Paper text:
On the other hand, U2AF small subunit, [name], binds to the 3′ side of the boundary sequence between the exon and intron, known as the 3′ splice site (3′SS). Then, the recognition of 3′SS by [name] is a critical step for the determination of the excluded intron for the production of mature mRNA. [name] consists of conserved three domains, an N-terminal zinc finger (ZF1), a U2AF homology motif (UHM), and a C-terminal zinc finger (ZF2). As [name] was stabilized by the binding of U2AF223, structural and biochemical experiments were carried out with a complex of [name] [name] with the short fragment of U2AF2 spanning residues 93–161 (the [name] complex), as previously reported.
In order to clarify where and how [name] binds to RNA, we solved the crystal structure of [name] complex with RNA containing 3′SS sequence, 5′-[name]. Nine copies of the [name] complex with RNA are found in the asymmetric unit. Without RNA, N-terminal 14 amino-acid residues are disordered and not visible in the electron density. This region of [name] is stabilized by interaction with RNA, and ten additional amino-acid residues (Leu5–Lys15) can be modeled in the RNA-bound form. The −2A base is stacked by the aromatic ring of Phe20, and is sandwiched by the side chain of Arg28 in ZF1. The nearby Cys27, which coordinates a zinc ion, accepts a hydrogen bond from the N6-amino group of the adenine −2A. On the other hand, the side chain of Phe165 (in ZF2) interacts with the guanine bases at positions −1 and +1 through perpendicular and parallel π–π stacking, respectively. The O4-carbonyl oxygen of −3U forms a hydrogen bond with the main-chain amide proton of Ser34, whose hydroxyl side-chain hydrogen bonds to N3 imino proton of –3U. Our present crystal structure indicates that [name] has a strong preference for guanine at the +1 position in the exon sequence. +1 G forms a π–π interaction with Phe165 and cation–π interaction with Arg150 involves the six-membered ring of the base, which lies further from the RNA backbone than the five-membered ring.
Numbering used by the authors:
A (entry chain B): 106 to 161
B (entry chain A): 2 to 194
Write the structure that this text describes.
RNA sequence: UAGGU
């Protein structure tokens, strides 16, 4: 099979590249909630009406 | 005479909304007189109002052209990396418009339709920058048919209120590093078999 | 209900 041939071929040319799952992300704004909303889920916050989309 | 002519998805299709079919967003929203067919299967997802351009806030115009470039690169990196955990990201587009329907819209086209469905199922319960993220499947397929032409060459006279996508492109260095990083991550999740 | 087939 050439599958393991091309996989190790691609890996070797990308030796000095970091995989995307490893990348150190400084100041990642994901999962950051506003103060006081630690116990509020994202679904409950959207239905509350405090976080409307600009269209509405 | 090689094939029948059609008008579906065009601005002559007076029943379906051409703008929602191509751009995935319409200024009229849910009150539109024309049809917005929301796909049940799609490779592309939509996260509206995800990107808040600092230039549209107080102290926005307190930044240099280099600082603004590094800040948007930080956002595009933060977007691409997180969306990659759901599947192979074919393209990531960030809209710099100011219209209510397109402001800060983040479109993500995955390689498989299952990766797009898994993304919206997980994103709709997550937060980003102290705001809950809205995620949905988008009918957008070819971004060339949704981008503004006069904005690519020179500037568009309609400005930020243009109803076509005014995509903000990241640095080519970051985009290249992201595509190579995803290929390695995908290649590493292949040597296990 | 448009500028974009
Ligand atoms: Zn519409
Ligand atoms: Zn434009």
């Amino acid at each position: 099979e050439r599958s393991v041939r091309s996989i190790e071929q691609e890996l070797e040319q990308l030796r000095d590249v970091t995989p995307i799952n490893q990348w150190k992300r400084k100041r990642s704004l994901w999962d950051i909630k506003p103060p006081g909303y630690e116990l509020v889920t994202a679904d409950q916050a959207k239905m509350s009406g405090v976080f409307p989309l600009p269209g509405a | 005479a090689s094939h029948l002519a059609s008008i579906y998805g065009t601005e002559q299709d007076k029943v379906n909304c051409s703008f929602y079919y191509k751009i995935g967003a319409c200024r009229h929203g849910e009150r539109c007189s024309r049809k917005h067919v929301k796909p049940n299967f799609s490779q592309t997802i939509l996260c509206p109002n995800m990107y808040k351009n600092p230039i549209h806030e107080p102290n926005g115009k307190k930044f240099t052209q280099r600082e603004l470039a590094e800040q948007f690169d930080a956002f595009y990196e933060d977007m691409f990396c997180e969306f990659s955990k759901y599947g192979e990201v074919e393209q990531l587009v960030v809209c710099d418009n100011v219209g209510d329907h397109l402001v800060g819209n983040v479109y993500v086209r995955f390689k498989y339709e299952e990766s797009a469905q898994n993304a919206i199922d997980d994103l709709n319960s997550r937060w980003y920058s102290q705001r809950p993220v809205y995620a949905e499947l988008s009918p957008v397929t070819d971004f060339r048919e949704a981008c503004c032409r006069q904005h690519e060459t020179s500037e568009c006279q309609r400005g930020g209120l243009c109803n076509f996508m005014h995509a903000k492109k990241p640095s080519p260095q970051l985009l290249r590093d992201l595509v190579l990083a995803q290929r390695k991550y995908l290649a590493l999740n292949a040597a296990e078999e």
